Design a protein around this ligand. Structure first.
Ligand SMILES: [Mg+2]
Lengths: 236, 51
RNA sequence: CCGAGUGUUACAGCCCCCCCGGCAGCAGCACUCGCCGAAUCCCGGGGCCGAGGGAGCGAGACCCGUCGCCGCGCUCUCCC
RNA sequence: GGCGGGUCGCGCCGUCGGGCCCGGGGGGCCACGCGCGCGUCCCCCGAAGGGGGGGACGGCGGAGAGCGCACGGGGUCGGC
RNA sequence: AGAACUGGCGCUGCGGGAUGAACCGAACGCCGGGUUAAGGCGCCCGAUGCCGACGCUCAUCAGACCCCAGAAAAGGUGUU
RNA sequence: UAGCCCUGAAAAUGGAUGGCGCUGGAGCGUCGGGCCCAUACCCGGCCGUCGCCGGCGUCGAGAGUGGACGGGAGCGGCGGCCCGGAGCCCCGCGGACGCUACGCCGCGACGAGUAGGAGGGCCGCUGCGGUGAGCCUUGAAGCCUAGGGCGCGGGCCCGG
RNA sequence: GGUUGGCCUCGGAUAGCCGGUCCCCGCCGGGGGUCCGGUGCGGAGUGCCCUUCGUCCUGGGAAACGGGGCGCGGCCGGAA
């Protein structure tokens, strides 16, 4: 199984033509001329009785609803969210300082690390400077500041991923009693593994942060529009 | 009705020559670009060789 | 002595114009020649509003029409 | 002895046209049964009225199998 | 007051002409996005809050946008 | 001689470039680039109307825009001792909705309106023939309602 | 209903602004020589706070007023 052998230049237009790919593929000398299980039967299992049992499983249903809707019409490919594409802005490369616009944090300045596998971008302005742990954020709710920090060979742990930073819920109790789900008052003390996962990266970005002078106090600060400070007049 | 002149392969359902009309013109204005970028450099490189 | 400001007849001892012979290498270009254009044309991106509506010529289909046209690549040869 | 009209011939023009051709001394092509015989055209050879090649064929002598993809493809879904 | 040709009003909303039968644009099912027509963009009042271009003009009665809603002969060493 | 301004230029309630107001213009002439919006134009959704049709094949077995057999001769592809022949559904007995044909489905263009003319009313009122094994003193008609809705509307259904 | 306040020369415009030896008006102000800056940088295209997460440990620069006051008391300043 070779690779694509036809380098694109524009989306869906290969560089080599139809006849030029007939000779790159050598299709002239590979032209050709050459050319269930309903189920398994079961043992009988009983005295005075033979006749190994019927070839049938996954039987006809016990019930049909009184009405049914017609089948859809397929239309095209409209692939699901696990397969779409991952797009970044060119103003966001790793190491960049970001500004959180809509969180609980709302203007805390954070250090961008990695764009995760399903769109959200992994970020921490480190917990000793901000109050920002290894949270995900979303791309279009941050502001890429034109300052960066050069962390191009630090580390990133492979185990912390999109299914790491998820919220947890298992809806067993359906009975109307005065406790709200018995697990909703509780802030998670499962940090005991997430705390170790930060000190693996909290202890190797503060060397980078405490190399350029003012930056650690800049990260302690928060962002605010004050009086004549207008965005569109501001070089971020 | 989709729009030819806006998406590919609705042109090509109507005009198959419009693909090879298009990579014959994306190739040549990628090589005319190279012919002018190298000309602007290699002229002023010898100018930078003097001074 | 130097410099400035005026007024004369004066034609290189600032310059400018018109000619007869040139070069660099030519740019509708170092935003005034901006002209008029694209089978002589394409690429990429941002804003907005919208999402209306039993396709299987095959298998005698069976959890389950990722199907038609259209353009595309991979294998049923081999080597690096 | 001057001023035009039609025709012939000469050299000179133009990213001319005829896919032309015609023998010779890198880029593009929706163009691909070696063996031979059905015509056509061209190249050869000493002859001099024959064979040996090549190019192309709107016709016959030589001349099947889909396998899983991906999709600017018969009006949006998420297996967020 | 009375005819000719065409359009309109009557039967016809809508944008504009401040106002309106007939002017000027445009004719109309119920809505969203886009773009314009006539007209406009100091503020009523949407839009020139353009570093708009060249000139003309001083009124002790200035001027100010089809129909259209106020002026003439004559005159001024007023200014161009 | 002709542009602007001035004289010529007087009317009755207080008053009209629409007003406020404007004089490096918000005036007049010649023009530029932006920009503002109609029921107009374009693209989309829906309603109706007109036009042109589709479907009796509910045919999960129909497979059909040229098909037969069956004889005399031929090549390919199939199972060899270079000679050879129909298999009619099945391991699953299964397979959505539909066609009030006066109903369903598709596609395209259109939609102003007085006088006037037609069509539809599953709009409404009163009585009659039929019919709902209708409905009710465990509450009919009528009337009231900041109650719940439905229809483009005429109107209607329900709750109290 | 609002998401920080500016606690102030006169004004000229074919001209203004600042700093300053000497000559005069009860230790302030008016005049002139002198020096500046001036598409205003002693610049509301600005300036002071600030975009201050808090705290702890622990060193340098700065800093000798303390700064928030429900303290206490006194002064005179401000009549459009
Ligand atoms: Mg007209």
């Amino acid at each position: 199984p070779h690779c694509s052998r036809n380098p694109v230049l524009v989306r869906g237009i290969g560089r080599y033509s139809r006849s030029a790919m007939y000779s790159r593929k050598a299709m002239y000398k590979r032209k050709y001329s050459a050319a269930v299980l309903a189920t398994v039967t079961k043992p009988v299992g009983g005295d005075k009785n033979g006749g190994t049992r019927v070839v049938k499983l996954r039987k006809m249903p016990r019930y049909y609803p009184t009405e049914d809707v017609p089948r859809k019409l397929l239309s095209h490919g409209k692939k699901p969210f696990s397969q779409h594409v991952r797009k970044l802005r060119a103003s966001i490369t790793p190491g960049t300082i970001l500004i959180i616009l809509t969180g609980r944090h709302r203007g805390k300045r954070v250090v961008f690390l990695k764009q995760l596998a399903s769109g959200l971008l992994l970020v921490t302005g480190p917990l000793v400077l901000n109050r920002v742990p290894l949270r995900r954020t979303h791309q279009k709710f941050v502001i890429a500041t034109s300052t960066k920090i050069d962390i191009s060979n630090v580390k990133i742990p492979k185990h912390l991923t999109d299914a790491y930073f998820k919220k947890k819920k298992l809806r067993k109790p359906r009975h109307q009693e005065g406790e709200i789900f018995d697990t909703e008052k509780e802030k998670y003390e499962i940090t005991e593994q997430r705390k170790i996962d930060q000190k693996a990266v909290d202890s190797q970005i503060l060397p980078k942060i405490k190399a350029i002078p003012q930056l650690q106090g800049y990260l302690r600060s928060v962002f605010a529009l004050t009086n004549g400070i207008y965005p569109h007049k501001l070089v971020f | 009705k989709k729009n030819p002149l806006k998406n590919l392969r609705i042109m090509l359902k109507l005009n198959p020559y419009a693909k090879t009309m298009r990579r014959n013109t994306i190739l040549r204005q990628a090589r005319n670009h190279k012919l002018r970028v190298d000309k602007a450099a290699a002229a002023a490189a010898a100018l930078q060789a003097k001074s």
